[PDB]
Design a binder for this molecule. Structure first.
Ligand SMILES: [Mg+2]
Ligand SMILES: [Mg+2]
Ligand SMILES: [Mg+2]
Ligand SMILES: [Mg+2]
Ligand SMILES: [Mg+2]
Ligand SMILES: [Mg+2]
Ligand SMILES: [Mg+2]
Ligand SMILES: [Mg+2]
Ligand SMILES: [Mg+2]
Ligand SMILES: [Mg+2]
Ligand SMILES: [Mg+2]
Ligand SMILES: [Mg+2]
Ligand SMILES: [Mg+2]
Ligand SMILES: [Mg+2]
Ligand SMILES: [Mg+2]
Ligand SMILES: [Mg+2]
Ligand SMILES: [Mg+2]
Ligand SMILES: [Mg+2]
Ligand SMILES: [Mg+2]
Ligand SMILES: [Mg+2]
Ligand SMILES: [Mg+2]
Ligand SMILES: [Mg+2]
Ligand SMILES: [Mg+2]
Ligand SMILES: [Mg+2]
Ligand SMILES: [Mg+2]
Ligand SMILES: [Mg+2]
Ligand SMILES: [Mg+2]
Ligand SMILES: [Mg+2]
Ligand SMILES: [Mg+2]
Ligand SMILES: [Mg+2]
Ligand SMILES: [Mg+2]
Ligand SMILES: [Mg+2]
Ligand SMILES: [Mg+2]
Ligand SMILES: [Mg+2]
Ligand SMILES: [Mg+2]
Ligand SMILES: [Mg+2]
Ligand SMILES: [Mg+2]
Ligand SMILES: [Mg+2]
Ligand SMILES: [Mg+2]
Ligand SMILES: [Zn+2]
Lengths: 60, 24, 98, 112, 206, 155
RNA sequence: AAAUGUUCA
RNA sequence: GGUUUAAUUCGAAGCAACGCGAAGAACCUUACCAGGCCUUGACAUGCUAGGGAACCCGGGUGAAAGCCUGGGGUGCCCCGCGAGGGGAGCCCUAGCACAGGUGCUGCAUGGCCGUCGUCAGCUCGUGCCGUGAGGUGUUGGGUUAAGUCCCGCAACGAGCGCAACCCCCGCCGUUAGUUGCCAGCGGUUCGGCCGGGCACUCUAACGGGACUGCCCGCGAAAGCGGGAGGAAGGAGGGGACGACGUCUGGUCAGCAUGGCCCUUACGGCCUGGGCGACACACGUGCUACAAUGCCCACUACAAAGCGAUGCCACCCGGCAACGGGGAGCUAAUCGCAAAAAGGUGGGCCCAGUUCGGAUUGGGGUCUGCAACCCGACCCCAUGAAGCCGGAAUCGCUAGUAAUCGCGGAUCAGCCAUGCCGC
């Protein structure tokens, strides 16, 4: 049950409480940062490619 | 007392305010 | 009068255009209190390195947003047609507050 | 400019090259003949030379394989006196066979 | 189980960003989505032209989009046309005016993304279970690199027992920040399954 | 410490009486980095040695520290499945280390309800003669004696 | 002067 | 873990599974169960033919889903008049080719991760040795955090590692003045607040500084010991960075992918339940057993972050949580703050207590359609076990341990005592 759900989420279908965040790259439900609209697996996958404007390895 | 809701410490800990820890 | 704030992820391309704007405004009269470096807002993300399950071991990330301030005390029509047209921003954004 | 860190790293390097090179740098496509003093002492040298079909001319003495030597100079291999004499005459012969000449190159060291 | 992306490890230094463009925590999130679906259609339609790196710049609310292809004739041709369509599709999926400039590669096999491909197609073309690799590296070196590396992983030759074959030649200090090593990932889809190809190319330094 | 010999941290002289000690002690009195409340307890400790004796704190202090520090002890040698106590002398550094430890240790053993009073009172008994700390010191003393037979092998 | 101290794809 | 259950979902399994995936389970999420419903389908690419077609609002039934039913429309094109007729999306029915699977296999895989191990190692080119597998180099002495370096040596060099190049912190400089300040005079509703000022502090940009450079001693050298100067030295303190490889390690439930399997269902929708069960076992933790303590009033000193259908000053009702009002703030300019431990005054007087707060009754607040299962707060009343913990066992070598509080991601809210940070 993926495709059915990835889209079931894109839609408004009643109330605002039933809506939820879910990765824009993979379907991932948990660990998606709202600033990127990405799950933490993708956030890293892309961060290493230099595809996320600004953003780089920490170190302090 | 950190777990005692009816106290200074108790409130601070829980992260709340009330009769026992007024919002200044 | 005419405060201009410019933000950027890259501190080089930022200070870059930051001066380019200054050197411009002066090049038309108008005094300009140099570009002052306002404090940076750092946004970090800490993610589990592994996709599955290895809670200890992660990789820190940060999106440092730089800020620069530039005031041109006494403007005029000349110090507008330049800083209202002549550009160069690609990874920098400026907000003009009069 | 080169970071002082490497300056030593490098100057410390040519020192061992200069120390383990200052001399063999005159080589240009192997030699036509090797001149060793103590064949037994420089066995390695002999082997290599002999392996490459190069003549071997050493001046060893009782305690070395004279069969590994193509042109022997049976005589003392230790005394500076003995070595110096033989090398001297050898080199004199060398120059004389090309072009003057004297005198007697500063060979004498201290002889005790 | 180790080694961090040679690219993301340099970014700030040595390497640059594949898509530079500031944004507000109110837009950024979105602006990102577009970039991704813009690189989406271009990864499939321009595959034929061997494209390596899709720079995306955003100025006064615009969209640069610079495709660095090994064959600019694939997106345009030997005359002048085609592309004219891609530009229309990039807007067809983005209600915006997106430019689209082609580019070339000094040397196609001096670019990791490209090298870890082309011949690494020879894998889907049922050939060179190894030499394909040794061949690539030679090409890279021959083209004046200071070191190169290629790694293939998977059911090599179609075997059952997965393996891992890598090149070996030239300098490739993955630990050096001032290195400037290029990196590209393949992915060979085969009847027997997926095979991943990694290419590393060491260029200049300091 | 495999590489080489530790290295002792030089403590900051006391603000009042000065002295490298007092701090060492105060440091042992302290817990949870909750100093001040600890340095105080020590100075507060005068009431009992000041007008309770009139001898001058520091001097008594240094006298207890000396009477409660051991000169020998037992350890434990790793013999083949034997493990004996074995005598062995005591380092000047351990003497002080141990002396100050037991002092505070024995101090918080006493029945007085107030900390400032527990110490000092313990410093006083210790000052000369009895004291829970001195007793502890007098026992580590016994061991080294009760096992003078296993001294034949000292590491 | 380690009292002993077994087994397992 | 196990045991229950209609379901209690699935994975993880010594270290390297067990506050792990889960950086947010009331419905959503969910993959599970029961019951009611839909089937070219919640969606992708297209083809045939009747027709209809952008769209928007109702009625019936029902828990919702669903099923049934009734209201209304041509910018494009032909000059063809228009009411005859073709057409574009696009919407519908019916049929076709297909969609979907969180169904299986990590023992077919990619990718990413863990781990030995930040251990100092792992190799190559030519030369030499051995019939050969291989050896040497890289065995040895000294030295180092280190295959770091030095000296030796049939080896002479080189590569992947170590180190350095990158970030943070320590001292200083230049550039820069809506943060800073009588630092200097001025005026002050005595708030840098007003003129005024860049000196301090600070914000931030690229520069300086350190290296055993210097002195003394030991040494063949590398280096070791010590001293001066210096903010800082002998890697100054932390990060980032983890070699050839090992674990048929981990993940087909992030994703991708070969093969196997289900296609009026092993796909899809909905309401309700469940993942929160409880005789038991274990792991990580929180709060404690108290006087170096506790409680109350007052009074100080941070850092790093986060904020527009957001943070919410300041008022007012309420004892509270909150509620009404309501300024500022696109935030070095407003506020979430106030830090806590500390300091000062008072209270408790060694007791299962003014230690400890479990548990339970009751009364409220707030988010959300909704808090029975199953939320978080507030208030009254309860007030439990615990006064120090067996065999065993874990963490830490310094601004560390210990202790004190603050922030953030996720997020309507929150079961966070977790996690990443200050
Ligand atoms: Mg939610
Ligand atoms: Mg209490
Ligand atoms: Mg943990
Ligand atoms: Mg048996
Ligand atoms: Mg389970
Ligand atoms: Mg499974
Ligand atoms: Mg669900
Ligand atoms: Mg549910
Ligand atoms: Mg449900
Ligand atoms: Mg499976
Ligand atoms: Mg597996
Ligand atoms: Mg495996
Ligand atoms: Mg794998
Ligand atoms: Mg190391
Ligand atoms: Mg043999
Ligand atoms: Mg041979
Ligand atoms: Mg070999
Ligand atoms: Mg060899
Ligand atoms: Mg070897
Ligand atoms: Mg090395
Ligand atoms: Mg050697
Ligand atoms: Mg300064
Ligand atoms: Mg400064
Ligand atoms: Mg390194
Ligand atoms: Mg498994
Ligand atoms: Mg899968
Ligand atoms: Mg439920
Ligand atoms: Mg659970
Ligand atoms: Mg329950
Ligand atoms: Mg605790
Ligand atoms: Mg009130
Ligand atoms: Mg008091
Ligand atoms: Mg509930
Ligand atoms: Mg009670
Ligand atoms: Mg009891
Ligand atoms: Mg008691
Ligand atoms: Mg350590
Ligand atoms: Mg929250
Ligand atoms: Mg609960
Ligand atoms: Zn994702």
């Amino acid at each position: 049950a993926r495709k059915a759900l990835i889209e079931k989420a894109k839609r408004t279908p009643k109330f605002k409480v039933r809506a939820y965040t879910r990765c824009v790259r993979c379907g991932r439900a948990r660990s998606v940062y709202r600033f990127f609209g990405l799950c933490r697996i993708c956030l890293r996958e892309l961060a290493h490619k230099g595809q996320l404007p600004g953003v780089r390895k920490a170190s302090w | 007392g950190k777990g005692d809701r009816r106290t200074r410490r108790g409130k601070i800990w829980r992260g709340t305010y009330g009769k026992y820890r007024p919002r200044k | 009068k005419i405060r201009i704030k410019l933000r950027g992820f890259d501190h080089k391309t930022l200070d870059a255009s930051a001066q380019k704007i200054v050197e411009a405004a002066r090049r038309s009269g108008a005094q300009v209190s140099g570009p002052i470096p306002l404090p940076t807002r750092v946004r970090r993300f800490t993610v589990i390195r592994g996709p599955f399950k290895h809670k200890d071991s992660r990789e820190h990330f940060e999106l440092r947003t730089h800020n620069r301030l530039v005031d041109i005390i006494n403007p005029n029509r000349k110090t507008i047609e330049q800083l209202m047209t002549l550009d160069l921003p690609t990874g920098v954004e400026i907000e003009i507050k009069t | 400019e080169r970071p002082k860190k490497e300056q030593v790293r490098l100057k410390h390097e040519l020192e061992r090259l200069q120390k383990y090179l200052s001399g063999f740098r005159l080589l240009k496509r192997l030699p036509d003949a090797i001149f060793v003093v103590d064949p037994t002492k420089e066995a390695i040298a002999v082997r290599e030379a002999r392996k490459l079909f190069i003549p071997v001319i050493a001046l060893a003495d009782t305690d070395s394989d004279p069969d590994l030597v193509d042109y022997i100079i049976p005589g003392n291999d230790d005394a500076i006196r003995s070595i110096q004499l033989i090398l001297s005459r050898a080199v004199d012969l060398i120059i004389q066979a090309r072009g003057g000449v004297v005198e007697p190159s500063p060979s004498y060291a201290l002889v005790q | 189980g180790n080694k961090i992306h040679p690219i993301g490890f340099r970014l700030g230094i040595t390497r640059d960003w594949e898509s530079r463009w500031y944004a507000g925590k109110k837009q950024y999130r979105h602006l990102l989505l577009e970039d991704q679906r813009i690189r989406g259609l271009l990864e499939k339609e321009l595959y034929s032209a061997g494209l390596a790196r899709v720079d995306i710049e955003r100025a006064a609310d615009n969209v640069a989009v610079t495709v660095h292809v090994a064959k600019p004739g694939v997106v345009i041709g030997r005359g002048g046309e085609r592309i004219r369509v891609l530009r229309e599709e990039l807007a067809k999926l983005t209600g915006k005016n997106v430019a689209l400039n082609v580019q070339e590669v000094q040397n196609p096999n001096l670019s990791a993304p490209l090298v870890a491909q082309r011949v690494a197609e020879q894998i889907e073309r049922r050939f060179a279970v190894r030499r394909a690799i040794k061949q690539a590296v030679q090409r890279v070196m021959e083209s004046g690199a200071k070191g190169a590396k290629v790694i293939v992983s998977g059911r090599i030759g179609g075997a059952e027992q997965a393996r891992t074959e890598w090149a070996a030649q030239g300098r490739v200090p993955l630990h050096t920040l001032r290195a400037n090593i290029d990196y590209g990932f393949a992915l060979a889809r085969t009847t027997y399954g997926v095979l991943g190809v990694k290419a590393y190319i060491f260029l200049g330094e300091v | 410490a495999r590489r080489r010999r530790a290295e002792v941290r030089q403590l900051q002289p006391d603000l009042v009486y000065g002295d490298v000690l007092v701090t060492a002690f105060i440091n042992k009195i302290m817990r949870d980095g909750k100093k001040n409340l600890a340095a105080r307890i020590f100075y507060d400790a005068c009431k009992i040695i000041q007008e309770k004796t009139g001898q001058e704190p520091l001097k008594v202090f240094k006298q207890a520290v000396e009477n409660v520090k051991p000169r020998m002890e037992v350890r434990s040698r790793r013999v083949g499945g034997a493990n004996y106590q074995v005598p062995m002398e005591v380092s000047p550094r351990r003497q002080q280390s141990l002396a100050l430890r037991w002092l505070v240790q024995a101090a918080n053993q006493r029945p007085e309800r107030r900390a400032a009073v527990r110490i000092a009172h313990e410093l006083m008994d210790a000052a000369e003669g009895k004291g829970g700390a001195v007793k502890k010191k007098e026992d580590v003393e016994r061991m080294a004696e009760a096992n003078r037979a296993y001294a034949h092998y000292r590491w």
